[PDB]
């Protein structure tokens, strides 16, 4: 039942069954050859009289060993290659999913956790498919075959002693758990002492000033004493684990092998049987670790598969709504919009507003209100539930989301880099129009070519994977150049305007004011520099729009009491 | 040569030799008994036939086993107990030295690293003392004795094969190293892929905004393809290693033990010597890990010893200079003080000033000048080199450094607490006077009891190890009180004044003004609130004192041109 999701996940990469089955069967054959090797050893050792004729047995054993090595090598290569192909397919599906369907809010939930889950679960699935399932089949077959062959070879006497010895595990394993518990307690006490010292030492100034340093010494003494006491207890428990373990193991060892020697000396049908017995004991003991590791890795992998299938279950639409974009220039209306992240909370309540076309609109919001929710809302990163964000006659649910996103230019505050080269930063505006070779010319129009006129290069200019050698002012100029290049129709801005000061702000204002003199813009930042360039201003408070009209007189009057109190809170 | 520092460092805890030597000798005799066990096994095997004397041999073997168990248990307990006493002594010495001597600038050189060298290095030294040295001695003795006994037992035939076999390990090692290199390459490429993915997700907003969801998918696919290629290479190299390890190890085991059976069957004198040989082979193979680990950990132990001896080398003085304090009320004068942290840099140049006694003095410094260095110099953590901070005619050269710090109470806005209870906080200065039981009365005069009048308790009030449940103003007020009870003769202030607001600042200022009017006071902080209360002010610029006199008219004039520009920079 629980293996059905894992089988389906493997089935997503369909052409991966025949070669896996062949590899597993070949591994089984290799295990059987390994089982057969000690019988050849016994036959050789019983052919004692003719050393020269024992050369034939030596050659046969060498040939069998080489055949086993070759078969195991081919099976391992097939298993690993098929597992790598399965992992490539799984990662391909996961990356196709995460980038495309997961909506912005899903990525806001957890960014690093998503990547950690993807990588760790893919690695765990690889480890399960390539090694642990084949390892478990190999171990089970080897153990069963070895026990059967020992039963056939020795009558019962040595083998029942061997199977009784596992009682040594019943005597040893629980004591190891007590050892582990004591060691963990010691580690905890050491961590506590380290924390105490890491607290005391940085405050050394206060101690030395207070002239109470010796008192701290006394406190430190106590800590040391504590650890010493615990150490003593560990020592005592060690004196119960150190010898005893060895004793039991050695005793068990002797018993088994001792009986073998007994059966050799008593004339019982054992000799080469004893040699084969020791080899079979090795081949029995070794795969138990593989079996236990598989049993634990299955428990890890079922949860890994649950996480992966949780990732793969998300959904989204891009052009499913329709395709009805023709002009995308018409006044934008908010009509009774009331929706946030979850319908229960209702973080937005009946938000309505009117904005003209080709008209500059500013948004002023508080530190903790609904400015961020609205900012994401006029980007449609959230799906409307009750209200209507209507461009014209509610076509926003009618045409494609990609079509609108193509007609809008976004820069909020940082928008740092898409790592690579500036060629990537200007080629993100390649919507099948490839922009021919005018990009640099556009950089000249966007006041970016003259700024970049130093030219370390144009295509080999690397910002680096980290992207730290270029400051903010240049990168927002590049972002605005990209926005102008792409599709200067509608711009929504959170004002990249920061601590750049006069030169950068004036340059961006001249670039923008010239560019959108006939195009619609929205501004949502805090400062009052864009609002004077904004012919219409709004205000967000408690998840509600409160304020409409022009800037000067209205925010001279509307902002007299409550917005002024909010400001006085802001600088304070 | 290199072991002399470690021997001396252990010698610092002198009475730890005889019992350690006895424990080591008992471990040696335990190893000898372990060597003796297989010979008794062989004698039992040769007895084989008749029953009751076989029972006597079994009883002898059990007695030898239990004797080994008891002796090993006692040796392990003695070794561990002596090691824990040694580690207690070492940690005690380290904590004494660390708290008492090192002057503050040593502690600010490195804080967490010092605690790490206190804890982890001691753990390494204890591990070497308790287990690894005894482990190495017992392992070398066991290996040599087992080889010698095998040489006596089997003439040369089986042991020569056994010692020629390590050619198998010689072949094995380079292949394992290539495995490790390929695994590290895989880890590195997985790290790069995770870094790429962790880079992309934060920029998901831009990715969707630029409608470029597919090229980013393509970059992810390229990364997945690179990882798949490297995984295929890892598979091709893996398919050779594992089969080779299995083949070579199984072949060596088959060779050795099949030759043992060859001798036991050929009528060669290997009757029960085969069983004895297998037991001795296990006793040989098992202790190789200890011998390898002793060599691995020796370098770490020697490094830990070097770090400890480096810790123990720092020197300092408290009352060595002299003892000539009588009243401790004289005007403080600076005489061409020129020194910072290192003589070559000369971060201070001929700093001189005149400050009266019982007069409040405030210091004004820039953001990056010498205000902090002069702050720490007035509190004299630093030892003068060229100039002289002269208070009292050079008796400042010959009274106790400690005796002065008695007369000064340190309070700053940073200082959170010393973790524990309020009782410790108010009575840390039990400078042999213990203040009888005047602490509560002291609180009531010093405006602490009336503020703490809520009384969760007076002695059980715990501020916690973290100390997060109380705000800065309260702890600053308790620190001011503590200054008022240690020795209210000289006061130094960084102005505890923070964001508490006039309601607390004026109150604490009037409290200290009433309490500390007739005695000296020193202020160094930024604001201009204590400056009006300070009779004389100074100014620090470029590591030089520039400005002396009263407050109002002079910094109405002196601060008009240059200090005003610094202020305008501060607000900007």
UniProtKB/Swiss-Prot annotation, chains A, B:
UniProt note: domains: In BmrA the ATP-binding domain (NBD) and the transmembrane domain (TMD) are fused. This is considered to be a half-size transporter that undergoes homodimerization to be functional.
Location of this chain's protein in the cell: Cell membrane
Positions contributing to ATP binding: 365-372
SUPFAM superfamilies in UniProt: ABC transporter transmembrane region, P-loop containing nucleoside triphosphate hydrolases
Stated pH dependence: Optimum pH is 8.0.
Main location, first listed in the record: membrane
InterPro entries tied to this protein: AAA+_ATPase, ABC1_TM_dom, ABC1_TM_sf, ABC_transporter-like_ATP-bd, ABC_transporter-like_CS, P-loop_NTPase, Type_1_exporter
Entry's EC annotation: 7.6.2.-
Coiled coil residues, start to end: none
Keyword Ion transport tagged: no
Entries under Gene3D superfamilies matching the protein: ABC transporter type 1, transmembrane domain, P-loop containing nucleotide triphosphate hydrolases
Membrane topology: Multi-pass membrane protein
Enzyme active site: 495
Subunit organization: Homodimer.
ABC transporter domain segment(s): 332-567
Record lineage: Bacteria, Bacillati, Bacillota, Bacilli, Bacillales
Full protein name: Multidrug resistance ABC transporter ATP-binding/permease protein BmrA
Stated role: An efflux transporter able to transport Hoechst 33342, ethidium bromide, doxorubicin and a number of other drugs in vitro into inside out vesicles. The endogenous substrate is unknown. It has been suggested that NBD dimerization induced by ATP-binding causes a large conformational change responsible for substrate translocation. Transmembrane domains (TMD) form a pore in the inner membrane and the ATP-binding domain (NBD) is responsible for energy generation.
Effect on the protein upon substituting residue 371 to R: Retains 2% ATPase activity; unable to transport Hoechst 33342. Traps ADP in a beryllium fluoride-dependent manner, confirming ATPase activity. Probably unable to undergo NBD dimerization
TM region(s), chain numbering: 20-40, 58-78, 133-153, 155-175, 240-260, 269-289
């Amino acid at each position: 039942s629980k293996l059905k999701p894992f089988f389906a996940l493997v089935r997503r990469t369909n052409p991966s069954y025949g070669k896996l089955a062949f590899a597993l069967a070949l591994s089984v054959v290799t295990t059987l050859v390994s089982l057969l090797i000690p019988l050849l050893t016994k036959q050789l050792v019983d052919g004692f009289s003719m050393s020269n004729l024992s050369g034939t047995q030596i050659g046969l054993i060498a040939l069998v060993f080489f055949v086993q090595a070759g078969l195991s090598a081919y099976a391992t290569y097939a298993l690993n290659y098929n597992g790598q192909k399965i992992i490539s397919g799984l990662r391909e599906l996961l990356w196709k999913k995460l980038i495309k369907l997961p909506v912005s809010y899903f990525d806001t939930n957890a960014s690093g956790e998503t990547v950690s889950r993807v990588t760790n679960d893919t690695m765990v699935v690889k480890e399960l498919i390539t090694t642990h399932i084949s390892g478990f089949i190999t171990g089970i077959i080897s153990v069963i075959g070895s026990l059967t062959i020992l039963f056939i070879m020795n009558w019962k006497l040595t083998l029942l002693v061997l199977v009784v010895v596992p009682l040594a595990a019943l005597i040893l394993v629980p004591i190891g758990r007590k050892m582990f518990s004591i060691s963990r307690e010691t580690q905890d006490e050491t961590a506590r002492f380290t924390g105490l010292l890491n607290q005391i030492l940085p405050e050394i100034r206060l101690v030395k000033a207070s002239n109470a340093e010796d008192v701290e010494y006394g406190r430190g003494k106590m800590g040391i004493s504590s650890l010493f006491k615990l150490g003593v207890r560990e020592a005592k428990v060690q004196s119960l684990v150190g010898p005893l373990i060895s004793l039991v193991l050695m005793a068990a060892l002797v018993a088994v092998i001792g009986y073998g020697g007994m059966q050799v000396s008593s004339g019982e049908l054992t000799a080469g049987a004893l040699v084969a017995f020791i080899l079979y004991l090795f081949q029995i003991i070794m795969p138990m670790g593989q079996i236990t590791t598989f049993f634990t890795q299955l428990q890890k992998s079922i949860g890994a598969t649950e996480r992966m299938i949780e990732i793969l279950a998300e959904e989204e639409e891009d052009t499913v709504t329709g395709k009805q974009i023709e002009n995308a220039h018409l006044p934008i209306q908010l009509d009774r919009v009331s929706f946030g992240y979850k319908p229960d909370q209702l973080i937005l309540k009946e938000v309505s507003a009117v904005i003209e076309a080709g008209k500059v609109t500013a948004i002023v919001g508080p530190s903790g209100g609904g400015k961020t929710t609205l900012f994401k809302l006029l980007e449609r990163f959230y799906s409307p539930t009750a209200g209507t964000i209507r461009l014209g006659d509610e076509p926003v649910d009618t045409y494609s989301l990609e079509s609108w996103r193509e007609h809008i230019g976004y820069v909020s505050q940082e928008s740092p880099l898409m790592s690579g080269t500036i060629r990537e930063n200007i080629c993100y505006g390649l919507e099948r129009d490839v922009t021919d070779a005018e990009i640099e010319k556009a950089a000249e129009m966007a006041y970016a070519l003259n700024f970049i006129k130093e030219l370390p290069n144009q295509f080999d200019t690397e910002v680096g994977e980290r992207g730290i050698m270029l400051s903010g002012g240049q990168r927002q100029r590049i972002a605005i150049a990209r926005a102008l290049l792409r599709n200067p129709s509608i711009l929504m801005l959170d004002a990249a305007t920061s601590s750049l000061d006069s030169q950068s702000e004036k340059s961006v204002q001249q670039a923008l004011e010239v560019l959108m003199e006939g195009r619609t813009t929205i501004v949502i930042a805090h400062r009052l520099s864009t609002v004077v360039d904004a012919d219409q201003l709004l205000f967000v408070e408690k998840g509600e729009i409160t304020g409409r009209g022009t800037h000067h007189e209205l925010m001279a009057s509307h902002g007299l009491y409550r917005d002024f109190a909010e400001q006085q809170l802001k600088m304070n």
